[PDB]
Design a protein around this ligand. Structure first.
Ligand SMILES: CSC[C@H]1O[C@@H](n2cnc3c(N)ncnc32)[C@H](O)[C@@H]1O
Ligand SMILES: CSC[C@H]1O[C@@H](n2cnc3c(N)ncnc32)[C@H](O)[C@@H]1O
Lengths: 272, 272
């Protein structure tokens, strides 16, 4: 059996590897290289430009935290935007909320969506929900053009000052944005940059950490943006209905705990 | 430049790798293979039987959490035992406490201690402290023979029913033990076994998670054992004196947060 190994200028000097049971699909799309393989121990793996996008084993950690943090804080979210997220993990978690009326997703690469529908049925299942509307376009263009405003925007992608202005303007007065935001173990300067962009517009910017083995350094953060001084560290609801019985990572207590950061990280961000 | 890669039957199907700036020392000791190398991005690395023991970049996360969790809960700890811990990270954190009168360490491999004193001076610096006494022996034998009882025992090693009986008996009536205890991402069955051994004797057994990139899956847990129903989730003191000004991970809030576990883990351990 061969091994898949992920290298990157973004995390030099380190690599993470998974053993391949079977290579399932490869293509060069208009945007990126796409690889799908069954691993021996982490289930199926989505790889984009040589970077692990997701594995069946741990994906719920990231998709649950990213979704349920803002959605338990938003009081009655009706309209939600996912930026990126072609795999449909976030959408799957969004559909659990009966109150939601519409879910727009803007993914630039339709190949990601179709590969997820074929190879990752338990991740992409939300696409069948009638509330879900797909836009195949650059989120930068989407956000300049959208007429609606959203209760929550979830940026599920690996970002500059103009981008956060567009997110701010696309949100309701009391709207929230959460965005994927680096590992505290390797890119503190980036986290500081991102926090600085966000603070230009948002009155409350907070950072949370998710434990997930197949992201570099075994963790990834959520940059949390609020228009009210109250923020996203405390949920306003418990997830008690039958739709949430299946949750594997997220709970009421973990929500708040994820904002309790290592001392080195608080020191770095304190003067921003 | 070559790469160091860690493989193991303990985490099959996955591997983590660091780039080597320079190999610094190798030997087969009486107990294990020992390797020391400067990595390109994580500083110096200690490797024992092909498993990363520590890196200069992230060691403070593990040594701070393991030490300051029990030591902020113990009211006036005088006598502390470290089991394993030859690198001296725990001892370094123990010496910060003026109240401590004695620190016994039982490490089976004196080569680890001497390699740490030579190659890892900022980790092994606590060995110079006059309160520190070294026992080169199997902790199993040490614990059967010791006459003193301890306020805190820190098991810094990778454990069975008889071992926890020995720890229970080596502790004061109000004593605490914390032990290194697996990644929740790969060895839930082990965590359940360990919790089951501990609960036979200890009235309060709790599990905490530490984020640390160079442990498999980027995290490691602390099995927490208390003789009083109150447990180890809430500190009784703040670390405010000049000795703790340097802390890089541990703080008052992170202490409690580390006990807030993913929902899948609570479900697995609930019926133990
Ligand atoms: C599957 S999760 C991350 C996703 O973000 C998508 N993505 C990357 N850049 C953009 C962008 N500018 N607009 C919309 N989606 C994007 C990628 O194609 C990937 O599917
Ligand atoms: C350096 S951290 C982990 C340490 O635990 C030590 N160790 C392993 N097994 C035992 C044991 N049975 N008794 C004491 N120390 C041990 C190892 O030699 C290593 O130095």
């Amino acid at each position: 059996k061969k091994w898949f190994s992920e290298f990157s200028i973004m995390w030099p000097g380190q690599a993470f590897s998974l053993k391949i049971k079977k290579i399932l699909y490869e293509t060069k799309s208009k945007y990126q290289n796409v690889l799908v393989f069954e691993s021996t121990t982490y289930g199926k793996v989505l790889v984009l430009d040589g970077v692990i996008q997701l594995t069946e084993k741990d994906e719920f950690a990231y998709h649950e935290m990213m979704t349920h943090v803002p959605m338990t804080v938003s009081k009655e979210p009706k309209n939600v935007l996912v930026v990126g997220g072609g795999d449909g993990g976030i959408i799957r978690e969004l559909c659990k909320y009966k109150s939601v009326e519409n879910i727009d997703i803007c993914e630039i690469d339709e190949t990601v969506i179709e590969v997820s529908k074929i190879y990752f049925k338990n991740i992409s299942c939300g696409y069948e929900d009638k509330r879900v509307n797909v836009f195949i376009e650059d989120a930068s263009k989407f956000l300049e053009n959208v007429t609606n405003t959203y209760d929550v925007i979830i940026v599920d992608s690996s970002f500059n000052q103009n981008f956060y202005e567009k997110i701010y303007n696309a949100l309701k007065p009391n709207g929230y944005c959460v965005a994927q935001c680096e590992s505290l173990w390797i890119h503190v300067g980036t986290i500081k940059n991102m926090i600085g962009y966000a603070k230009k517009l948002f009155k409350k910017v907070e950072y949370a950490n998710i434990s997930i083995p197949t992201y570099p350094c075994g963790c990834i953060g959520i940059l949390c943006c609020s228009k009210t001084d109250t923020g996203l560290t405390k949920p306003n609801k418990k997830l008690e209905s039958k739709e949430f019985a299946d949750l594997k990572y997220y709970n009421y207590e973990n929500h708040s705990a994820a904002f309790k950061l290592p001392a080195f990280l608080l020191k770095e961000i304190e003067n921003i």
